[PDB]
Amino acid sequence: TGYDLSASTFSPDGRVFQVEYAMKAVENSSTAIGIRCKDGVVFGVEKLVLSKLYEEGSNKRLFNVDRHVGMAVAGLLADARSLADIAREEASNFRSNFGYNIPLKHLADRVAMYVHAYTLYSAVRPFGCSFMLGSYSVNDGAQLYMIDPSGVSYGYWGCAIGKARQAAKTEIEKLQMKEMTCRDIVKEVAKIIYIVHDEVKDKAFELELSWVGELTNGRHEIVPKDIREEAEKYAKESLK
Amino acid sequence: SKMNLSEEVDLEDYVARPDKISGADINSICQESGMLAVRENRYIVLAKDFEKAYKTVIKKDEHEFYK
Amino acid sequence: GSSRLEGGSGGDSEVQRTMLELLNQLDGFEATKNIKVIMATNRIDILDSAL
Amino acid sequence: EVDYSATVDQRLPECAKLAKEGRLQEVIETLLSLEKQTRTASDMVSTSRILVAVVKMCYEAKEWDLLNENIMLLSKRRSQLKQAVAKMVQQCCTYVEEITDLPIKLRLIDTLRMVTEGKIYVEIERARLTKTLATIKEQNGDVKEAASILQELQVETYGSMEKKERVEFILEQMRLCLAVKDYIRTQIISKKINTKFFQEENTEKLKLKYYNLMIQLDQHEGSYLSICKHYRAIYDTPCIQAESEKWQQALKSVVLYVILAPFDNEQSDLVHRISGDKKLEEIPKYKD
Amino acid sequence: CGKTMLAKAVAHHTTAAFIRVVGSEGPRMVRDVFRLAKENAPAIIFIDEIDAIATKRFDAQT
Amino acid sequence: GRLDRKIHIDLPNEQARLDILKIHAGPITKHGEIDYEAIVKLSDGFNGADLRNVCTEAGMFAIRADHDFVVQEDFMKAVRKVADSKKLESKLDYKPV
Amino acid sequence: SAGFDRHITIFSPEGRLYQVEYAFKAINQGGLTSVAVRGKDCAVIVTQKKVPDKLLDSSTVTHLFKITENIGCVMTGMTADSRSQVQRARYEAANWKYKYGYEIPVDMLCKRIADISQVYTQNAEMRPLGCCMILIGIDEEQGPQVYKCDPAGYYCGFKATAAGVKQTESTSFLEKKVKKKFDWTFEQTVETAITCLSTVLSIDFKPSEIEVGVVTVENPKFRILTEAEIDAHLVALAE
Amino acid sequence: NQYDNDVTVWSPQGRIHQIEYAMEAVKQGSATVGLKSKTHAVLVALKRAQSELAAHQKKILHVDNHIGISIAGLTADARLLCNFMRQECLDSRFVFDRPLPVSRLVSLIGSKTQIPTQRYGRRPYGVGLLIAGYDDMGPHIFQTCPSANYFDCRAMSIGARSQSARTYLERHMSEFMECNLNELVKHGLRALRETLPAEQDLTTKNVSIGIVGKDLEFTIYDDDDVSPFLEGLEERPQ
Amino acid sequence: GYSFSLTTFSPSGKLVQIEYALAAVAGGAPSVGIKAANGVVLATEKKQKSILYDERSVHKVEPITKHIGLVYSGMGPDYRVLVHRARKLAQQYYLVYQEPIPTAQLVQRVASVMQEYTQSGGVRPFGVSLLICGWNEGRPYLFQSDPSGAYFAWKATAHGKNYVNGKTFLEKRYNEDLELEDAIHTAILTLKESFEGQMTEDNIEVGICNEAGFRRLTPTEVKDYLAAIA
Amino acid sequence: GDLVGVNKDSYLILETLPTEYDSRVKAMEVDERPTEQYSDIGGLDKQIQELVEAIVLPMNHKEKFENLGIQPPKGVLMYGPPGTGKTLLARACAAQTKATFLKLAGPQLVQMFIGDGAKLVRDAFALAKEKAPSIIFIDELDAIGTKRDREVQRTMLELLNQLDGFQPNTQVKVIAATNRVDILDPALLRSGRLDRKIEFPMPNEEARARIMQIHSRKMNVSPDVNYEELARCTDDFNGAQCKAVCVEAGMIALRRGATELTHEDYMEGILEVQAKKKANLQYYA
Amino acid sequence: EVIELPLTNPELFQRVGIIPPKGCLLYGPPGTGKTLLARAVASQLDCNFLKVVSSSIVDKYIGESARLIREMFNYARDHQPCIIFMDEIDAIGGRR
Ligand SMILES: Nc1ncnc2c1ncn2[C@@H]1O[C@H](COP(=O)(O)OP(=O)(O)OP(=O)(O)O)[C@@H](O)[C@H]1O
Numbered sequence A: 001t002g003y004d005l006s007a008s009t010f011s012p013d014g015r016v017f018q019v020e021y022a023m024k025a026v027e028n029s030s031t032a033i034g035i036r037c038k039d040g041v042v043f044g045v046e047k048l049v050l051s052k053l054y055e056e057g058s059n060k061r062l063f064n065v066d067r068h069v070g071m072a073v074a075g076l077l078a079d080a081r082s083l084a085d086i087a088r089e090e091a092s093n094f095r096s097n098f099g100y101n102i103p104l105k106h107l108a109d110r111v112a113m114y115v116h117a118y119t120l121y122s123a124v125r126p127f128g129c130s131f132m133l134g135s136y137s138v139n140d141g142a143q144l145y146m147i148d149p150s151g152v153s154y155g156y157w158g159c160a161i162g163k164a165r166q167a168a169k170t171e172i173e174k175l176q177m178k179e180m181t182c183r184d185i186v187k188e189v190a191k192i193i194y195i196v197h198d199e200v201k202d203k204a205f206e207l208e209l210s211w212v213g214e215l216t217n218g219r220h221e222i223v224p225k226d227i228r229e230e231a232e233k234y235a236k237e238s239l240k
Numbered sequence B: 001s002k003m004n005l006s007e008e009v010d011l012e013d014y015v016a017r018p019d020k021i022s023g024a025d026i027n028s029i030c031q032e033s034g035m036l037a038v039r040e041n042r043y044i045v046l047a048k049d050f051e052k053a054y055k056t057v058i059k060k061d062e063h064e065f066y067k
Numbered sequence C: 001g002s003s004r005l006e007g008g009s010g011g012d013s014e015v016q017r018t019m020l021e022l023l024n025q026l027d028g029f030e031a032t033k034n035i036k037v038i039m040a041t042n043r044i045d046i047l048d049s050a051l
Numbered sequence D: 001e002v003d004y005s006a007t008v009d010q011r012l013p014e015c016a017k018l019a020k021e022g023r024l025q026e027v028i029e030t031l032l033s034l035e036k037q038t039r040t041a042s043d044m045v046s047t048s049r050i051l052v053a054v055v056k057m058c059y060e061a062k063e064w065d066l067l068n069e070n071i072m073l074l075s076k077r078r079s080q081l082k083q084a085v086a087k088m089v090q091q092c093c094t095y096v097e098e099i100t101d102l103p104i105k106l107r108l109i110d111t112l113r114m115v116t117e118g119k120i121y122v123e124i125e126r127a128r129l130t131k132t133l134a135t136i137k138e139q140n141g142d143v144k145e146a147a148s149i150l151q152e153l154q155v156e157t158y159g160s161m162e163k164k165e166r167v168e169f170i171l172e173q174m175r176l177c178l179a180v181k182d183y184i185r186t187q188i189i190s191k192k193i194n195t196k197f198f199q200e201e202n203t204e205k206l207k208l209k210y211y212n213l214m215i216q217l218d219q220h221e222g223s224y225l226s227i228c229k230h231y232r233a234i235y236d237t238p239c240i241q242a243e244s245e246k247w248q249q250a251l252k253s254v255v256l257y258v259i260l261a262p263f264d265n266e267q268s269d270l271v272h273r274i275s276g277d278k279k280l281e282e283i284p285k286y287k288d
Numbered sequence E: 001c002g003k004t005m006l007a008k009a010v011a012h013h014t015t016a017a018f019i020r021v022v023g024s025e026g027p028r029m030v031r032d033v034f035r036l037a038k039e040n041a042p043a044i045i046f047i048d049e050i051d052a053i054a055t056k057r058f059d060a061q062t
Numbered sequence F: 001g002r003l004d005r006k007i008h009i010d011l012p013n014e015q016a017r018l019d020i021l022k023i024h025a026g027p028i029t030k031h032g033e034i035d036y037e038a039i040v041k042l043s044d045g046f047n048g049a050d051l052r053n054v055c056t057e058a059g060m061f062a063i064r065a066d067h068d069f070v071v072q073e074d075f076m077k078a079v080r081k082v083a084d085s086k087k088l089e090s091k092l093d094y095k096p097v
Numbered sequence G: 001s002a003g004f005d006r007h008i009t010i011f012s013p014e015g016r017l018y019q020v021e022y023a024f025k026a027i028n029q030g031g032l033t034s035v036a037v038r039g040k041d042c043a044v045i046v047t048q049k050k051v052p053d054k055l056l057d058s059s060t061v062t063h064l065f066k067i068t069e070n071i072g073c074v075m076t077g078m079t080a081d082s083r084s085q086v087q088r089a090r091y092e093a094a095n096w097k098y099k100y101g102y103e104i105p106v107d108m109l110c111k112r113i114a115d116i117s118q119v120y121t122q123n124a125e126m127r128p129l130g131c132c133m134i135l136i137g138i139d140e141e142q143g144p145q146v147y148k149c150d151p152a153g154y155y156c157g158f159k160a161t162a163a164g165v166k167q168t169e170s171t172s173f174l175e176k177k178v179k180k181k182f183d184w185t186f187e188q189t190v191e192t193a194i195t196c197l198s199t200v201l202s203i204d205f206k207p208s209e210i211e212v213g214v215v216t217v218e219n220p221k222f223r224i225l226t227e228a229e230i231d232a233h234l235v236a237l238a239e
Numbered sequence H: 001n002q003y004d005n006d007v008t009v010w011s012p013q014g015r016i017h018q019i020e021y022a023m024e025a026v027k028q029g030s031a032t033v034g035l036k037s038k039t040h041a042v043l044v045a046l047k048r049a050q051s052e053l054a055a056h057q058k059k060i061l062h063v064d065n066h067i068g069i070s071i072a073g074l075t076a077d078a079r080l081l082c083n084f085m086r087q088e089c090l091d092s093r094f095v096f097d098r099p100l101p102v103s104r105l106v107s108l109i110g111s112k113t114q115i116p117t118q119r120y121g122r123r124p125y126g127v128g129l130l131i132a133g134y135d136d137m138g139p140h141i142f143q144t145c146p147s148a149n150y151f152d153c154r155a156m157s158i159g160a161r162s163q164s165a166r167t168y169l170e171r172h173m174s175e176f177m178e179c180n181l182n183e184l185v186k187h188g189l190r191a192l193r194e195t196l197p198a199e200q201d202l203t204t205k206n207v208s209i210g211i212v213g214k215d216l217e218f219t220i221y222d223d224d225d226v227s228p229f230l231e232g233l234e235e236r237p238q
Numbered sequence I: 001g002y003s004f005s006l007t008t009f010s011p012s013g014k015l016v017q018i019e020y021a022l023a024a025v026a027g028g029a030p031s032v033g034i035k036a037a038n039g040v041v042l043a044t045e046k047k048q049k050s051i052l053y054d055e056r057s058v059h060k061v062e063p064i065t066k067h068i069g070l071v072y073s074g075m076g077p078d079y080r081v082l083v084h085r086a087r088k089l090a091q092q093y094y095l096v097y098q099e100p101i102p103t104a105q106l107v108q109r110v111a112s113v114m115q116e117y118t119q120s121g122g123v124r125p126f127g128v129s130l131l132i133c134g135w136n137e138g139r140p141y142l143f144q145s146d147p148s149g150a151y152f153a154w155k156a157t158a159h160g161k162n163y164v165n166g167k168t169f170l171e172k173r174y175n176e177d178l179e180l181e182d183a184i185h186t187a188i189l190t191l192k193e194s195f196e197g198q199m200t201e202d203n204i205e206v207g208i209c210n211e212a213g214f215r216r217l218t219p220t221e222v223k224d225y226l227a228a229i230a
Numbered sequence J: 001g002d003l004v005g006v007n008k009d010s011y012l013i014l015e016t017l018p019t020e021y022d023s024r025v026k027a028m029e030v031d032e033r034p035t036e037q038y039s040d041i042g043g044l045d046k047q048i049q050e051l052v053e054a055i056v057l058p059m060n061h062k063e064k065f066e067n068l069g070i071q072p073p074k075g076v077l078m079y080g081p082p083g084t085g086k087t088l089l090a091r092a093c094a095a096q097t098k099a100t101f102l103k104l105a106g107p108q109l110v111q112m113f114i115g116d117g118a119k120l121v122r123d124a125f126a127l128a129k130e131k132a133p134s135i136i137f138i139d140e141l142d143a144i145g146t147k148r149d150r151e152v153q154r155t156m157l158e159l160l161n162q163l164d165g166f167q168p169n170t171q172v173k174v175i176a177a178t179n180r181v182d183i184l185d186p187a188l189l190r191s192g193r194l195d196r197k198i199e200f201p202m203p204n205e206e207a208r209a210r211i212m213q214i215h216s217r218k219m220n221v222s223p224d225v226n227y228e229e230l231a232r233c234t235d236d237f238n239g240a241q242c243k244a245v246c247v248e249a250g251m252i253a254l255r256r257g258a259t260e261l262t263h264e265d266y267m268e269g270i271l272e273v274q275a276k277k278k279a280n281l282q283y284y285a
Numbered sequence K: 001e002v003i004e005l006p007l008t009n010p011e012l013f014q015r016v017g018i019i020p021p022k023g024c025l026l027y028g029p030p031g032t033g034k035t036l037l038a039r040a041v042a043s044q045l046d047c048n049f050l051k052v053v054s055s056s057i058v059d060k061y062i063g064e065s066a067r068l069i070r071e072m073f074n075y076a077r078d079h080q081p082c083i084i085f086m087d088e089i090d091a092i093g094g095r096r
C-alpha cells in the first residue's frame, strides 16, 4: 500500500501509483479507435449496449467539443461528460476572445493542463478517462491529439484507447493510413472495431462514427451510416 | 593474494579511481572478476575481468534540496 | 504509569490493565506481613496519581 | 527488416558481366551506391553478399587500393550488422591465403588486423589472420616480432574458437616462445593447455608436438623427472607402440631421464614401474 | 567497511564467543541476549546498526 | 555468507510466454496452423502453469467435441477459459526479499 | 522511517524532507538524458528522443521548448508535469516582458521557476512538479549561460550535469572533457554533447532518436537543429 | 478498506468503490419503473408504507408542466435535486419562455452530480432518478445515478427487487412503442407488480403514478386517482 | 513523535517539528560569523557535488541593504524565499521610516515571519539558520535567527556541519578588539577547522559589514585571505 | 523406511509388514459408497459434465488423452455460494465412479502437534497412490487454504507440494470445495495445482424448478403444482433452500392432515424458508 | 553457473581462488517454474540430488527436526557431489 493513497504525495519510486489506477480505470471501458485520413479524422467508438432497457442511441460516447472539433473517450462516462463540457467552455473562450477559430494543438494543451492540474490537488482526483481529439483547419491541414489521464498530450497518425489499445493499434498499423481518403477509412474503422471482439463474450453493442474532414466541409459531424450501411456490411463480412 | 590473477592486472588504476568503494565492494569486485574469468572458462583472471567487474558493480549513491 | 493512547488507529488497553492489576494487588494489602513494595520513576511528572 | 532482395539479386548478375571482362569500375560504383540504399533496414542478406561481391572482384582486379579501402572504409560505417563484417572477412581470409606474394598479402593482413581488433564476431578470423602474419615473419627471419604477435594471440579468450584449433594455436605459440628463448612466457603459455585433450582419439600428432616442446622447455630447466613422464606419455601411444624404432628410442629417453633425475620417493617409484616393463629387453644395454 | 570482520577476528584470536544481533530485530529480546552472554563468561556481544533502536528520546506517540 | 545469490523468476514475458506455449503444445496432435502470437497477445499475466492449463483445456474441448485432433478454436476457447480462471486468481501483489 | 514521508511539510528526525527526494525518483523518466554544454560562443542542449511506438507523430513527441527568441528550454521528467512547468515559465516570462518592457533573463527565469517549485515544496496544498529543467540563454556582451532548475526548488545553472537516467557517467564524462584544457567552438561543443550521449547510452544513435536545441552569440535565436544537421554532426563524429 | 473511504482515492481495481456504495445506497430504495410510448411517458413508484395510519411516502415528484421524476434513494438528496430542477425550469422559462427540454436538463443533472464524485469531503447524492418528459423532439425517459452517468431508456426499473420488473419491461419493450396511454400505464402497473412478493400486490396505498403526454401536462395520480386505474386490471392468481 | 503536526504540543511541552528543523540546520553548509571591533565578518563555504557546478553562479552571501549582509545555514531554497521576504521587508522599513532598517529590528521582522510560518497544520517552517551582519548608528551588529522565530546577538558564532568545533574555536580564538583583517583571518581559520577539504578562490565566500557599507568579497579576495595566508 | 516384525528380545527381522499410514487416514477413505445419482442433481448439468470430463474420463479410458498427448487435469476446485450442489456433486462423483474415494474436511488435517498435519497430508497422498485408481475429495479448503497460526500453513504447504511438485499425478485426482475462494488466493488456486475451477452459480429459474421436482418426487405431490410459479417466487433461493421449501411444504401438509401436499403448501413453505426482509428503513423511504 | 559449474568444474574455482556460492534461493509468483527448474537441474546433472518439502522436515518429537537436517547435511557431505533442494523454505525460514 506504501504511500499510494493520494495523488499529491510522491509515493515510493517516482511512480505515484495513484494515476496508474486511472489508467486501469480506462482499461476497464470498451475500445475506441481513431484514424487520421488524408483530409479528416474518423472516430470509431464501440459502446457496449444491453439491448434490454436501452434507447438505441442513448448515452452515446461521441460528443461535440466544437463546431469543428470532434472527440472520443474511453473510461468513466461522467468524467467524459464533464470534461467535454470543459472543452466546450475552452473552445468558446478562445472563440470569443481571439475572434477566430481555436487551433487544435492549443485546445489540446489547455485540456491537458486541466487534466494535469486535477491530478495534483489533494482534495481532487485525476480523471478516469483518456480521450482523443480531432479537427481540420482548411488553412494548413488536419490536427489530432490524444491525452491520457495523466495529462500527456501526444499526436498520433492513428490511435486507440480502451480495453484493446495494443490490439487495435496493431490492426491500425497495417492500414495504408498514409494516403487514402476517409470514405474507405470509415469501413476500415468499422471492420477493425468488429474484428477485435465484436460480440464474442459480450452480448451486444453499438458502433458510432464521428467525422471531421475537408470533404465534410471541415465541421464536426456524425457519419450518417444509415445510407446503405456499407461499413456495417464490411464489419459483419469481417466474420472470416 | 588468494586470487590467481594475470600479470597484466593493474590494481593501481582501481585504487586511484575516484569512486568511493567500500571493503565489501572490493570483495565483490574480486569475486565478480573471478566469476567473469570462470564464465569465459579462462584459467586466469585478466585485466578486462577487473574492468568489467568494476563497472558492473559500484552503485552510484547520491542533491541541493538539502545543501 | 504513563499517558495512555486516547483513541486512533489503535490502542494499548493493556498497560492500563497491568496497572489496575498491580493497583488491586497492593490495594488489597495482600498478606501485608513483612512484605513491602518500592518503585522508581524518572521525572515524577509523567506518572499518574492512580497508584 | 525489409531485405531488399529484388533490388540487388538481379543487379549482381549485371555487375558480373562488367566484373569478369575487367572494367569493374561500374561494379564498384554500383555496390558502393547499393550499400547505402539497403543496409538502412538491417538488410543482412544483401550486405553479406554485396560486400564479398565488391571485395572479391577487387581481389582479382589486381588493384590493391581497390582491396584495402573497399574493406577499411566500409568497416567503419554506422549500424553495420556483425554478420555482414563476419561474412566479408571469412572471404577476405581466403583472398589472403591465395596471394603468395609477400607485400600484396602483407597489405591485406595489415588491413584485416586493423579492422578486426576488439570485435568478438571476427576474433577467430583475426587469430587465423594473425597466425599467417607470424608465418611471414618466420619466413623472413623476424622471429622476435612474431613472438609478440602470437603473444597478443590470447587463444583462450576467443570463446568462438573450436576445441582442437585453440590447442593447435598453442603449439605454434610455445614453438615461437622457445625460438626467442622466452622461457617465462613459454611457461605461462604452456601452463594453459589442459592434458585431458590428449584423451581424444585424434590428438596424437598434437600430443607428440606438445610433448616435444615441453621436453625442450623442462630440458632447459632441468626438470628431468617431468621429462621422464613426458616421454612415458609419448611412449604409451598406439601410434608409437607399433613402430619399433620410435618406441625403442622413447624407452631409451625414459630410462635415461629417470636415471638423470635426483633421488626422491617419486623417482624411486618411477624406477620400479619402468623396470617392470617387458619391452626393455629390446634395449638391454640400458636395462643394465 | 570491516566492523563485523574485525569483531569476528578479535573474537577468533581471543577465547571469546561471538554473539551477534542486528538492531532491526522487544526488551525481552535484549534481556535474553544479555542472559545468553552471561552463560559464557568471556563472550562478546555485537549489535549491528544499533542506531535504529538508539535514536534520540522524545515524547513518543504510538 | 549464507545465501548470497538471489534469483527472481518473474511472470513470463511475451516471448517467454510464446516459448512456453510452444513447448507445452508441441506433443499435442493439432491440425492446421496455430496462431501462438494471438494467444500470447490475449494471455496477459499468465504463468507457465496457466499456459499448461490452456493446452489442457484446448485438449478437453477437443475431447468433448470428439475430435481426434485439436484446432485453433480449441486453443482460443481454452485461453478465454483460463482467463476466467485467473479472474478467480485474486493474486495479491508480491514483493521480493 | 515511515511517517516523515507521508506528507511533504514534515521534517525527518535528521531534518530530511523525504518527499523532495521522492520527487527526484521520477526525474529519471527512462529514455531522456538532456546533456547541456557551454562553449566560448554557444550553448547546446541535446535530449534522447526515445519514441516508443511508430504511429505517433514525431513532432508532438518533442521535449524542448522556447519562451524567448533568445532563450531555449529542455525538460526531463513526467511529460504532463514538464508541459505544465513550461507553461508556467511562459506565463512568468510573458509577465516579465509586459511589465519591464524587455524579455526576462535566463538566470532570472530559472530563479523564478525554482522559486515556484520552492513555494510548492514548502506548502502541502500541492504536489511539487516532478521534472527537471535546463535553459540556454545569452547575457549582453557577457556570454552564453546554461541553467538548471529541479523539483528541489533550487538552481545552480552551471555548465552541464545532464539530469537523465545516465546521471553519473554523463556528468563524469563532461568533467573529464572540461578537466582537460581545450578550445570551445560550436561544432566542438555539439561534438562533446553528442559524444557524451553516445558513450553513456552506447546506442547507434540514428538521427531521429535525438533532438537538439542550441543558441549562439553569432545568431542568438534559439533553434532546434534539423535532422539534417543532426545527421551531419553524427557522421562528423562517427569518422 | 485502505482505498475505500472517499471518492477522491482510486482503488487498484481501476474503480472507486465509494461510487459503488452510492449505487448500493440507491438500490436500497424501493422499486420505481419508467416506460414511454410515442404518445405518453409514464412512471410508477412503489410508495413504502410506514404504518397502517401514516401516509405512504411520496416517491413521484412533479416540477414542470411537461416533466416529472420518480426517486429511489435518500429523500434529502432527491428533494435537493428536485429543488434544483425547480430552479432550472424557472429560469429557462424566464429567459426564453421555453419549457426546458428534458434531455438537456438530464445532462445538467448528470454534470452537477459529477462534481461531488471528484472532490474530497463531500458525499455524492446517493439517489437514482427516473425522468419522464415530452419535448419538441419527442417523448423521453431517463435515469440519473450517483455515478453521474445519465441514460435514456424506453423501459427501466431501479431500486430493490427491480430485476423481475426489468425482465417484464424487456419482454413488453416490443409493445410500448405504439401502445396508447391506458395500455402503457397498465403495463407499468403490472411491471411494478412484478417486483412485489407473492402476498403483496398493487394497491392504492403503495402505488403512485405520474404521466406526461403530447396532449396532457405531467400529473401525479394517487389513492383517489389510482383507484380508477387499478380497477379493471387483471388480478394476481396463484 | 509529535512532529507530523506543527500546531500541537507534546506532553513535555516540546513542538518536536521545530527541533527537527534545527536538526536540518547544522546538517547543512558550515558557516561562521564574528563581530570585530570595527566590522562584522560572515564566511561560508562553496563546495558542490561535482566540478561542473559553476559556484559563482550561486552566491550565498546576499546584501539585504548596502549596510546589511546575510548568510544562511545551508537550506538553499528556503533561504532564497526567506531572503526575498527579508529584502522586501527591509525595503518597506526603508520607505516607511525614510531611514534604513536597524539590524536588530530587521532580524526581529524576519524572525516574526519565521514565527508566522511556525503555526497552522498545513505548512512547515524554513529550516534555515540566518546570520545577519549590519551597521547601525556607527555600531556593528551580528545577529542570528533560527526557524523557531527566536533571535539573538552574538559577538561570534558558527552553524552548519561541525559547528561545535567552530564554537570552541571562537571561544578561545577570539577577542572583541580584533581588527577587520585579523577578523577575516579568524573567520577563515575557523572555516578551515570546520570544513573538510582544501579551499581556493572557488571554495569560500565572505561578506564584511563596515560602518561605511557592507560588501561581499570577490573570490580573488577570498583566495587572498584563505590562500597565501594562514 | 519399511515396517518389519522382529524378535521381541533378539530384534531379528522375521516378518515383513504392510506399511501403515495412520488410523485417521484409514478412516478418511470411503467404504459405504453413497448412492446419489447424477440425475438427482438439477440444473448443474454443465458443471457435472466439467467435473466428469476432468475426473472420470481420465479414469475410464486414458486413451483419448494420450492419443492427443494431453496431461489430464489433476486438480478441480469446485466452488459457489453455500446452498448449491457442491458437496452433493462430490458425493455423486464418489457414488458413480466406483473409485477408491478419499472424503475428508479441511479441519481434519489441522491437528495439534507441530509436525502432524504434514504427516496426515503425506500419508493420505501415499494411500491414494497405493490404491492407485483413487480420488481425493477435500471439503472446506478455507480451513487450511487461508492466504498468508503456523501449523495450518505447514499443512497447506505440504498439500501444495504433494500435489504439484516433483512427480505428482500418476493416477490421483483431487476435488476441492469451498465457499470463500477470495480467502485462498495465491497458494492453492494456481492453474498447475487446481487445473479446473468450477463455479457453482446461484441456481437458475429452471434449475430451481428441477431442484424442487427432484426433492419432491417421493412426496406424493398434488397432480397440479405450478413449479414454474414456485421458481418465480423463489428468486435468490439456493438448492438447499429449495429442498427446505419442499420439506416445509410436507410439514405444512402434515399440519393440515392432508394425504398429499398441494400448491398452497408450497407458498407456505416458501414464506417459511425466505428471509425476514429486514424492515422498512426510513433512510431512503 | 552457481550450482552446476562449481560442482562439475571446481578446478577453475580453487585455482582462481573464488569461494563458490554456498546456495541460491528462488522466488517468484506461483507457477513460474522454480520447482520445474530445480527438477531440470536434478534430472540433467549426473549426481546425488536431495529434495524435501520443508513442511515435512518438522516433526512433533522434541528436537527431531534439528537432528533430521543435521543428518541430511551429513549425508550430503558423505555422498558428494550432492545437491540438496529446498521447496517452500518459508515454512521454516520465516521471521521469528
Ligand atoms: N442442484 C441441486 N440439485 C439437487 N439438490 C441440490 C442442488 N443444489 C443443492 N441441493 C441440495 O442442497 C443440500 C446441500 O447440498 P451441498 O452440501 O452440496 O451444499 P453446498 O452448497 O456445498 O453447501 P455448504 O458449502 O454450506 O456445505 C442437499 O440436501 C442437496 O439436495
Ligand SMILES: Nc1ncnc2c1ncn2[C@@H]1O[C@H](COP(=O)(O)OP(=O)(O)OP(=O)(O)O)[C@@H](O)[C@H]1O
Residues within 6 Å of the ligand: F012, F020, F023, F047, F048, F049, F050, F052, J164, J165, J192, K029, K030, K031, K032, K033, K034, K035, K036, K037, K087, K088
Ligand atoms: N517457463 C516455463 N516453461 C515451461 N513450463 C513452465 C514454465 N513455468 C512454469 N511451467 C509449468 O508450470 C507448472 C509450475 O510448476 P512448479 O511447481 O515448477 O511452479 P513454481 O512457480 O516453481 O512453484 P512453487 O515454487 O510453488 O513450487 C509446471 O507444470 C511447469 O511445467
Ligand SMILES: Nc1ncnc2c1ncn2[C@@H]1O[C@H](COP(=O)(O)OP(=O)(O)O)[C@@H](O)[C@H]1O
Residues within 6 Å of the ligand: B022, B023, B024, B025, B026, B027, E001, E002, E003, E004, E005, E006
Ligand atoms: N578491510 C577489508 N578487507 C577485506 N575485505 C573486507 C574489508 N571490509 C569489508 N570487507 C568485505 O565485506 C564483507 C562484509 O564486511 P563486514 O565485516 O560486514 O563490514 P561491516 O561490518 O562494516 O558491514 C566481508 O565478507 C569482507 O569480505
Ligand SMILES: [Mg+2]
Residues within 6 Å of the ligand: J086, J087, J139, J177
Ligand atoms: Mg459442503
Ligand SMILES: [Mg+2]
Residues within 6 Å of the ligand: J165, K034, K035, K087, K088
Ligand atoms: Mg516451488
